[PDB]
Subunit: 180 residues, 4 copies
Amino acid sequence: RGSHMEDFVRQCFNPMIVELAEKAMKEYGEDPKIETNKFAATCTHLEVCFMYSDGGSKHRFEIIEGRDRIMAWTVVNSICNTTGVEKPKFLPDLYDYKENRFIEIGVTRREVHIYYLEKANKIKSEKTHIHIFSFTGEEMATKADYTLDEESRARIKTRLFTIRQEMASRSLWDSFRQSE
Amino acid sequence: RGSHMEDFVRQCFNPMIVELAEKAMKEYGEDPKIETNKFAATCTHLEVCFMYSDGGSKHRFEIIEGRDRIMAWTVVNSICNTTGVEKPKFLPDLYDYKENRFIEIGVTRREVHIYYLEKANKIKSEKTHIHIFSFTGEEMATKADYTLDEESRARIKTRLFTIRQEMASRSLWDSFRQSE
Amino acid sequence: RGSHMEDFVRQCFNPMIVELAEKAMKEYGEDPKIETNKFAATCTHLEVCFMYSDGGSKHRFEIIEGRDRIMAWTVVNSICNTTGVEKPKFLPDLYDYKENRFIEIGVTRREVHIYYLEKANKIKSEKTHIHIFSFTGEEMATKADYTLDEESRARIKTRLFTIRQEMASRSLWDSFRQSE
Amino acid sequence: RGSHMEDFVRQCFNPMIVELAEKAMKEYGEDPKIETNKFAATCTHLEVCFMYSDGGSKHRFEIIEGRDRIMAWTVVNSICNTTGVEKPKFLPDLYDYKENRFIEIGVTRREVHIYYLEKANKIKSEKTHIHIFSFTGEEMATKADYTLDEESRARIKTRLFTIRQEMASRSLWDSFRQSE
Ligand SMILES: O=C1NCCc2cccc(c2)OCCCCOc2cccc(c2)C2=NC(=O)C(O)C1=N2
Ligand SMILES: O=C1NCCc2cccc(c2)OCCCCOc2cccc(c2)C2=NC(=O)C(O)C1=N2
Ligand SMILES: O=C1NCCc2cccc(c2)OCCCCOc2cccc(c2)C2=NC(=O)C(O)C1=N2
Ligand SMILES: O=C1NCCc2cccc(c2)OCCCCOc2cccc(c2)C2=NC(=O)C(O)C1=N2
Ligand SMILES: [Mn+2]
Ligand SMILES: [Mn+2]
Ligand SMILES: [Mn+2]
Ligand SMILES: [Mn+2]
Ligand SMILES: [Mn+2]
Ligand SMILES: [Mn+2]
Ligand SMILES: [Mn+2]
Ligand SMILES: [Mn+2]
């Protein structure tokens, strides 16, 4: 295919993130060489989920994103069967052992307002906490409970805007923006 | 022997846990290739003991389980001879430098209620703290003092239920359950 | 060139610091083999900046010094575009996610009093926090807010005086002092 | 020489401790192959000093023991010239950046009472904090200020008694005891 977006994704993100995103897309019938915008988004979503899990105390989070579908659901079942929390219909991204709730992390190129609306209406488990990040430095969380402290969330916002700058410097941002 | 339980234990637990469990069983005249249920249980008990020791503050715990019998008793003697705590008749699993007591960690396929009864009656040192975990997500500790915080114990419960699911998915749980 | 200062810098600082200082000087048209005093100063400034970033809590600081000019400004733009802080005219050394301000770290062979005066007058962004260290063990910070706790700053002062002793023992301090 | 004490020291302590003790003894005209009791004591003293430095918060301690005489005094001079603390006449073992004092750590086979007396009378700098450990599990510190918390000191006491047991099991304790 020879996409410019593909070579930028491989130099922007670390090899473990790229490998997990490639495996995730292929598992769902998506090709990272063609759907290069989806390739960038899944890497971005993966890195955001991992910085998020690094922001709290040790042992605080259980990472669901980044596993295969079967093993991700297996850990969800164990979390539900040991904490009594209701089983979510869709795969979440983390579990907060402190607040005892699942977290769905979103990363959007639109307003954080409209994307949360889509995710809140998509998921039926109203117990699942939602936390949205934008590429412009905005965020929005369920009940205005942002889970982490200010500095951990600020790192994610800074990293997101750096990716945007790197994309625009290569004339790839406009195609990435009008693709969500 | 060629046991399905053997190959699952080697892929479920990390190689250091398997090696320590193999050495522990052989030291007591048990063969991991035949007593494959005991092989799974000792690996599970070993991993639970190590996650437990990782749950507290640094330097808080002294790990007794996972050593050879002679060296495990040597550290117990040093702990007793330096803290004044009475020497337990049976080998415990950890020592809590914070609460100044030995901890016996149990992992059961039955009710956490009955297993503690067996361990409390087995040990005569009533000073030794007892902490039981089940594969269903229940726990029970001496004086209702669970030592660690909620999230460290929840990780162990989640991990235990994941092992149960992995066993049942391979049709090995029923033999493991009716073997304790 | 065969400078004694060059061989001391390579044995005093760790190879990653030397490599970053060499790249920084060459990027600005300076040669570490000739401008050996500048070579020592940039290594010292780099090490001080990194010990500083290690002094606070995790995630607290964003390191700007030690990057290439383009990437350093790219992260600054993301920090400004996500926190609303005004863009500084000159490249700072760190960003404090806790106090929400940029930090300019200085290391001087003169009085900490006069060097801050030069840096305060050089920078127009009065929001940028200034923190000066001397080779004699003195420090001076904006609004007397020294950011870190006492022990993290004391380590830097101790390290600075050790470098001075190592220089004087090799008869290189006097040339280094009367060069700033 | 072929000493039993020599081979036990090499299997009891980690190779970095043995190497530092060997270098320390040779620097003072002592041979680890002959003065095997001194070899064991210097390894024990070195390990105790390092567990001690690991007991406090990060950045809290500056390790003086384990360096060459010239570099150990160079760091002492920098600590004194930056904190204003008086220069000790004899090399201490650590510096407490929290309490702003040097620490002399002793390890004795006699009563902690008599050994402190020798060290307090040896050193003239009454500012230098003294902390003694015994192989029986006793300790004694200046002004009853034990610096670290209870659990960090208990680890050192446990480790000391384990070394004693390992020595006595090899019939080397009695020669080690009546050698101090
Ligand atoms: O967890 C998730 N799993 C999805 C795995 C996946 C990978 C590749 C293709 C695909 C599914 O099909 C897309 C189905 C229609 C959904 O449209 C999108 C588009 C882009 C991102 C997301 C969803 C998304 N955002 C998140 O925040 C997530 O957590 C999350 N997906
Ligand atoms: O510490 C322990 N050391 C035992 C070492 C050992 C290994 C292999 C065989 C064996 C002994 O013989 C069994 C003797 C009869 C005891 O029956 C069992 C069966 C299964 C687990 C345990 C005990 C057990 N549960 C714990 O919780 C422990 O801590 C613990 N053992
Ligand atoms: O961030 C910085 N970037 C400068 C990068 C650089 C490297 C090599 C040569 C050069 C610039 O040209 C010098 C231009 C005139 C400035 O004179 C000096 C001399 C010595 C140190 C500094 C400035 C300095 N002190 C700091 O504290 C800094 O943070 C800092 N520089
Ligand atoms: O720091 C120290 N540096 C000494 C370096 C050294 C190594 C080998 C031989 C030697 C000196 O000559 C001995 C001179 C007479 C002193 O007798 C002893 C005997 C055994 C231990 C100590 C002192 C001692 N105890 C501590 O606690 C220390 O801190 C400490 N030494
Ligand atoms: Mn997801
Ligand atoms: Mn998500
Ligand atoms: Mn046990
Ligand atoms: Mn047990
Ligand atoms: Mn700078
Ligand atoms: Mn600077
Ligand atoms: Mn000493
Ligand atoms: Mn000493």
